[PDB]
């Protein structure tokens, strides 16, 4: 039960809707928001004239 | 008539002119002008193709 992370996906039987197996990696909402943002990842060595 | 039925009459005439036939004409008229009657009458050209 503890391994079953709340707000996470686990398998569900059909005739019984009983637990069948966990679901590995369904989704992270913050990651989706960031991907929608499409931030321009940079590098400190690529900083221009603002040492 | 030249707006709608003239095109179906001989669009080749307009083509020879050099322009495409009229696409769509909208009727402008102050309220209570009775433009709707104009269309009701224009319905007297096909009566099945309107």
């Amino acid at each position: 039960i503890t391994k079953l992370t709340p707000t996470t996906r686990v398998a569900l039987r059909n005739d019984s809707y009983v637990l069948h197996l966990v679901l590995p990696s369904k989704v992270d909402p913050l990651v989706n928001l960031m991907k929608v943002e499409k931030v321009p990842d940079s590098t400190y060595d690529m900083i221009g004239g603002l040492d | 008539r030249e707006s709608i039925e003239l095109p179906l009459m001989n669009p080749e005439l307009f083509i020879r002119v050099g322009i495409k036939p009229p696409k769509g004409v909208l009727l402008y008229g102050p309220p209570g002008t009775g433009k709707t009657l104009l269309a009701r009458a224009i319905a007297s050209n096909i009566d099945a193709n309107f």
């Binding site: 913050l30 989706n32 960031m34 943002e37 400190y44 | -």
Partner: protein, 45 residues
């Protein structure tokens, strides 16, 4: 160079579907940040 959670928002509405149903207050983003402590907040003009 700092390894922080970057989140820059322009006050759109599509992202609102992930913060909350209504987003009554601006605490919605904090909830996403609140569990990702290694985060930074950026806001455009």
């Amino acid at each position: 160079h700092t390894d922080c959670t970057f989140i820059r928002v322009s006050g759109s509405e599509l992202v609102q579907k992930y913060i909350g149903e209504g987003s009554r207050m601006v605490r919605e983003l904090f909830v996403m940040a609140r569990e990702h402590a290694p985060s930074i907040i950026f806001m455009d003009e």
